Write a protein that binds this DNA or RNA. Structure first.
Ligand SMILES: [Mg+2]
Ligand SMILES: [Mg+2]
Ligand SMILES: [Mg+2]
Ligand SMILES: [Mg+2]
Ligand SMILES: [Mg+2]
Ligand SMILES: [Mg+2]
Ligand SMILES: [Mg+2]
Ligand SMILES: [Mg+2]
Ligand SMILES: [Mg+2]
Ligand SMILES: [Mg+2]
Ligand SMILES: [Mg+2]
Ligand SMILES: [Mg+2]
Ligand SMILES: [Mg+2]
Ligand SMILES: [Zn+2]
Ligand SMILES: [Zn+2]
Lengths: 38, 222, 97, 162, 43, 63, 169, 176, 85
RNA sequence: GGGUUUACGACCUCGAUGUUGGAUCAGGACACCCAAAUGGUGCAACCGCUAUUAAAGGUUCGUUUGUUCAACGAUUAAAG
């Protein structure tokens, strides 16, 4: 996971979900694309 | 199913020679030997010159005031020259080379003793001024997408606009300032000297109409 | 059709869709028929038999899926959505297959 | 209303669709000229989290929201109704709109805290430990900001943050 | 925890005290009075 | 190559060819083998040139 | 004693803040929200060259040839599609595909309104002069999941059984 | 396994890459495939490339479908130029005629694509013209008595000077 | 592993007389040129130069819409050059 | 965004706010060294690198220098 202030997709498989009061860019193909809005 | 819409074709747009950005000097060929004062009038207030398009179609409009130096010039030059198309796009500067000197002092020096030494040069830019103006046979979405990076990296807030976008935003501003509901406006109050508010206001507020405060420019204030 | 392509439809024997083209509730039926007769479903398994029965006075569309687990899934889809039929068929063949 | 009936008869599954009778709209609307349902029934800026009879017209039996393309509401009122449904569910209204789980209804838990006019989710907010001073105060939000245009018979604005 | 640097209403970082509806209504009333005055002082 | 065994010819500098026997078989699960021989010279890369110059300077003491 | 232009937003005087709050912009809000208001009159659409060409092509098809069969366009591989193209060109019967948005209004305006429930999903119009349905039925029998929906043979709308009877005739 | 596209010479089908590892990963033998290809193309002039499609079944069996030789090769042969032009449109590579284009269309129509597609020879002629203009070869209507050689001498001088300039630029880049 | 060696044996004459690339089998039999008295008119009734333009085609045929669709594809491709995915 | 070094101004004390290092005592903050739960790795395992949450408990013994620092010896789960 990478904590960032501005999230953005890196491939066409990353999906943005609203969880725990924050935004999460989750990617199943490349797990290194996991982003979390701080 | 979807109806085919025609594509915008450009043929009267002649791409001139050397479409990329030129090199600018950190210090001009004739450096100012006499140190000058740091006037803030070159930043305060709206821009008077270079507010319209000359030959290009897109531009980087600065919605604020500040200074631009050789570092920012090199950043913009490299980014534009590496992300532009020299076969279908050309760029041009709207700001001159840095000429205003800035004085600095070394650490450990007490106050006073005289003026500092000329360290670098900057270019004063007011709000409402264009910085880089580009043209060619290209669309607006790609130039906007690739110029938003430069607009963000610029010190003052900036936007990648065009003729149509500037006209649209100016029409929106006029519409808002003419259909505003409250009868009390900053311009009217400052001109009539209502409530003796001239004691708090500035003589430049009579012209700024409460839209320009220092170096910041809020376009949503009528 | 991508769902049935990636679900591994090798474990089915026969799929027949019996319908009447001159009815007023055949949209989902023909959608399901095309989704199960797509090229990807065919390339997933070649031993399966896809049959499309066309009538004129049946007035009752139906889908019969016989697969080698001794199983016969019969879906009388006359008002169900094509997507609902597809997901139900997929869940059933994934649970028993 | 459409229902999916499944029958298990000797390794043979029968899935069928059954259409039942659904109640229709009332015959006389107060403002038949409006295009939106609420905007034509003149309930705009009138409903609230307390009005359960109005919110219960379009919700799935499992508390789910109904799609806009099938409902027909304008976008703003649809968002407002979604907020109101969330607030009612959190407050504890609509008791008959929860999924039946005979295995999970047995292990009772700590009693449900009585709440109302809640904005966020009960399991996604962290408590304020600093709480701020008077000039910089961490205000506690209550109610949805989308309902700030409701008619105020008292005339005072609705405190969206306290 | 939250310390106001310097004095409360002098330094570069002052108090963030906002404007209230009371002050807004007072200023609007004063503006209406001044508009009436500047009208009566026209003819 | 012949069949399931490709023979790759390449030109690798000797200064970087060290420690290759412990990497080739490690990435090929021990089924790979290599043979090399001195072939020619060529101008050195700037990074390695600066590195060997700094090495000579630290060997001779003075920078 | 701060400068006239600074970077820290230059926090204003209290009277200036009150003045700004008073002179804030107020947008015009109408009485009735025009969104769910009864919509304005219709801005009628114009016909384009593409839809005109489509109408002319459909008219020429339905006027010139005799056999107009309607089948369900099955999503098959392009190689098999071209193979079926070749096997149809052997008998000199062609295939066409028209969008529903242009085919439904033409059919409901013309005398072929009895084909509306046939053009719901994917559609394929087999066009033939001097109709010979025997070879068509034979070449469609070789593919199991490609069923003949219906069509008209000299202004005679028939179903699959009607086509089978016409072929056996 | 599936379909594999390849372009190998007539009789020069060696079991090495870039053909070896593909069928090796697929499962089928490489030497057997080379023997089949050589015995099937033994009558073909060794040296010309022709496209082939290898259909590999899950049981490690393979079938071969060979098409007509490469249209680029056909055009290069009809023009008499070994390697096509670099700057297409800016320079002229060869010179062909509509007669040669029609001949190439006639000899290439008997292939899988133009057999599945019931297209007349006009479509194939247009495709050949497109491929020729992509290669950079000009297609004159009917001019072949000596103009071919008149352009050939100039093209030879041009390519000789081009090779000299390429060697000079390479030496300059090596010295800089 | 290269191309065919036989290429323009007698370039000034043989290329003009007939085409040599028509023979694929090892048995060398080149076809005669078959002069204009054999080839039909559609061979010469086609464009052998630069293609036409959308500003030259008439918006009542099909090739006009073909070229318009091609130009729309080109426009979408030019606009999609800032893909961050 | 913080006010941890230097400097900047001299606002509080020059009818006194006694100034560095050590001994004892520690309190608090987390911008976490260990111990705890995890994500990603060009993470194969042991060793590693970064990110998140977490402060109830610890963070050594010696030579030299007055030394804070600094180098070295031996360890620890670590010598913030
Ligand atoms: Mg910026
Ligand atoms: Mg202060
Ligand atoms: Mg203070
Ligand atoms: Mg002052
Ligand atoms: Mg301090
Ligand atoms: Mg200072
Ligand atoms: Mg004091
Ligand atoms: Mg003192
Ligand atoms: Mg005292
Ligand atoms: Mg302590
Ligand atoms: Mg922390
Ligand atoms: Mg740890
Ligand atoms: Mg501690
Ligand atoms: Zn991703
Ligand atoms: Zn509405």
């Amino acid at each position: 996971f990478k904590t960032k202030g501005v999230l953005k997709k890196r491939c066409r498989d990353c999906y943005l979900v609203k969880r725990r009061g924050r935004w999460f860019i989750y990617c199943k193909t490349n797990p290194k694309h996991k982003q979390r809005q701080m | 199913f979807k109806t085919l819409l025609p594509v915008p074709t450009f043929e009267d747009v002649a791409i001139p020679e050397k479409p990329k950005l030129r090199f600018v000097e950190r210090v001009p060929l004739v450096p100012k030997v006499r140190r000058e004062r740091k006037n803030l009038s070159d930043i305060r207030g709206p821009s008077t010159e270079a507010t319209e398009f000359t030959e290009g179609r897109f531009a980087i409009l600065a919605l604020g005031g500040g200074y631009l130096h050789w570092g920012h010039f090199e950043m913009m030059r490299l980014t534009i020259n590496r992300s532009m198309d020299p076969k279908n796009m050309f760029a041009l500067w709207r700001v001159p080379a840095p000429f205003k000197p800035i004085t600095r002092k070394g650490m450990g020096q007490r106050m006073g003793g005289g003026k500092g030494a000329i360290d670098h040069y900057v270019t004063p830019v007011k709000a409402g001024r264009l910085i880089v103006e580009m043209g060619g046979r290209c669309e607006f979405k790609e130039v906007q997408g690739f110029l938003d990076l430069v607009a963000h990296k610029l010190p003052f807030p900036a936007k990648a606009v065009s003729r149509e976008t500037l006209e649209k935003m100016r029409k929106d501003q006029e519409e808002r300032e003419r259909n505003n509901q409250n009868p009390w406006t900053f311009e009217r109050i400052a001109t009539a000297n209502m409530l003796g508010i001239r004691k708090v206001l500035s003589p430049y507020d009579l012209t700024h109409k409460g839209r320009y405060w220092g170096k910041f420019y809020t376009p949503e204030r009528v | 059709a991508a769902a049935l392509a990636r679900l591994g439809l090798r474990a089915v024997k026969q799929v027949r869709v019996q319908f009447c083209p001159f009815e007023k509730n055949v949209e989902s039926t023909r959608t399901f028929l095309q989704a199960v007769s797509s090229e990807k479903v065919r390339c997933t398994n070649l031993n399966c038999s896809v049959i499309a029965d066309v009538r004129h006075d049946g007035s009752e569309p139906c889908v019969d899926v016989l697969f080698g687990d001794g199983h016969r899934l019969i879906m009388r889809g006359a008002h169900l959505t094509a997507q609902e039929m597809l997901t139900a068929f997929a869940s059933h063949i994934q649970a028993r297959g | 209303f459409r229902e999916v009936v499944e029958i298990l008869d000797g390794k043979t599954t029968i899935i069928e669709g059954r259409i039942t009778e659904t109640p229709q709209e009332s015959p006389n609307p107060p403002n038949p000229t409006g295009q939106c349902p609420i905007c034509r029934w003149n309930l705009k800026h009138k409903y609230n989290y307390e009005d359960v009879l109005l919110l219960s017209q379009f919700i799935r039996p499992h508390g789910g929201m109904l799609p806009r393309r099938i409902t027909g509401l304008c976008q703003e009122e649809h968002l407002k109704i979604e907020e109101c449904v969330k607030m009612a569910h959190r407050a504890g209204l609509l008791p008959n709109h929860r999924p039946k789980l005979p295995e999970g209804f047995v292990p009772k838990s700590k009693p449900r805290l009585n709440r109302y006019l809640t904005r966020w989710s009960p399991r996604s907010v962290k408590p304020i430990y600093n709480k701020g001073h008077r000039w910089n105060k961490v205000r506690m939000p209550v109610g949805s900001p989308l309902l700030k245009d409701n008619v105020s018979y008292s005339g005072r604005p609705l405190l969206l943050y306290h | 925890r939250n310390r106001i640097p310097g004095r409360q209403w002098i330094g570069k970082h002052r108090r963030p005290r906002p404007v209230s509806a009371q002050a807004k209504q007072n200023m609007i009333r004063r503006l209406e009075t001044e508009a009436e005055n500047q009208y009566w002082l026209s003819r | 190559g012949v069949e399931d065994y490709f023979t790759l010819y390449a030109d690798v500098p000797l200064n970087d060819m060290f420690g290759y026997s412990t990497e080739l078989r490690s990435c090929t699960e021990g089924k790979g083998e290599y043979t090399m021989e001195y072939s020619r010279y060529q101008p050195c890369l700037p990074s390695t040139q600066e590195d060997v110059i700094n090495k000579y300077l630290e060997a001779t003491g003075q920078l | 004693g701060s400068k006239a232009v600074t970077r820290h937003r230059r926090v204003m005087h209290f009277e200036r803040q009150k003045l700004m709050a008073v002179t804030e912009y107020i947008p015009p809000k109408p009485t009735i929200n025009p969104r769910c208001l009864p919509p304005p009159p219709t801005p009628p659409q114009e016909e384009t060259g593409l839809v005109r060409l489509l109408r002319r092509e459909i008219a020429a098809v339905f006027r010139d040839n005799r056999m107009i069969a309607v089948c369900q366009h099955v999503a098959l591989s392009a190689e098999d599609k071209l193979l079926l193209r070749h096997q149809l060109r052997k008998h000199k019967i062609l295939m066409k595909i028209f969008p529903n948005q242009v085919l439904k209004p033409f059919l409901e305006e013309s005398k072929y309104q009895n084909l509306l429930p046939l053009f719901v999903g994917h559609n394929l119009l087999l066009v033939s002069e001097e109709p010979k349905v025997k070879e068509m039925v034979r070449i469609l029998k070789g593919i199991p999941f490609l069923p003949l929906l219906g069509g008209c043979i000299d202004d005679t709308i028939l179903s699959r059984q009607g086509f089978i009877n016409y072929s056996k005739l | 396994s599936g379909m594999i596209r390849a372009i190998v010479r007539a009789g020069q089908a060696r079991p090495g890459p870039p053909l070896g590892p593909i069928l090796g990963q697929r499962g089928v033998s490489i030497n057997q495939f080379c023997k089949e290809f050589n015995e099937k193309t033994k009558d073909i002039k060794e040296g010309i490339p022709l496209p082939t499609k290898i259909f590999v079944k899950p049981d490690r069996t393979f079938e071969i479908k060979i098409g007509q030789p490469t249209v680029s090769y056909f055009l290069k042969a009809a023009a008499g130029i070994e390697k096509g032009a670099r700057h297409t449109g800016k320079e002229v590579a060869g010179l062909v005629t509509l007669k040669h284009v029609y001949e190439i269309a006639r000899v290439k129509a008997q292939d899988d694509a133009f057999a599945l597609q019931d297209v007349p020879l006009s479509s194939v002629v247009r495709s050949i013209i497109g491929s020729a203009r992509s290669l950079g070869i000009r297609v004159v209507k009917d001019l072949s008595s000596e103009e071919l050689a008149a352009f050939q001498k100039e093209r030879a001088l041009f390519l000789a000077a081009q090779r000299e300039a390429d060697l000079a630029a390479q030496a300059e880049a090596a010295k800089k | 592993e290269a191309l065919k060696d036989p290429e323009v044996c007698t370039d000034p004459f043989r290329l003009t007389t007939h085409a040599m690339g028509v023979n694929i089998y090892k048995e060398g039999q080149d076809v005669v040129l078959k002069p204009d008295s054999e080839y039909p008119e559609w061979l010469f009734e086609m464009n052998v130069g630069p293609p036409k333009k959308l500003e030259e085609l008439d918006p009542e045929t099909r090739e006009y819409w073909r070229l318009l669709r091609k130009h729309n594809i080109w426009r979408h491709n030019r606009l999609s050059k800032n893909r961050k995915f």
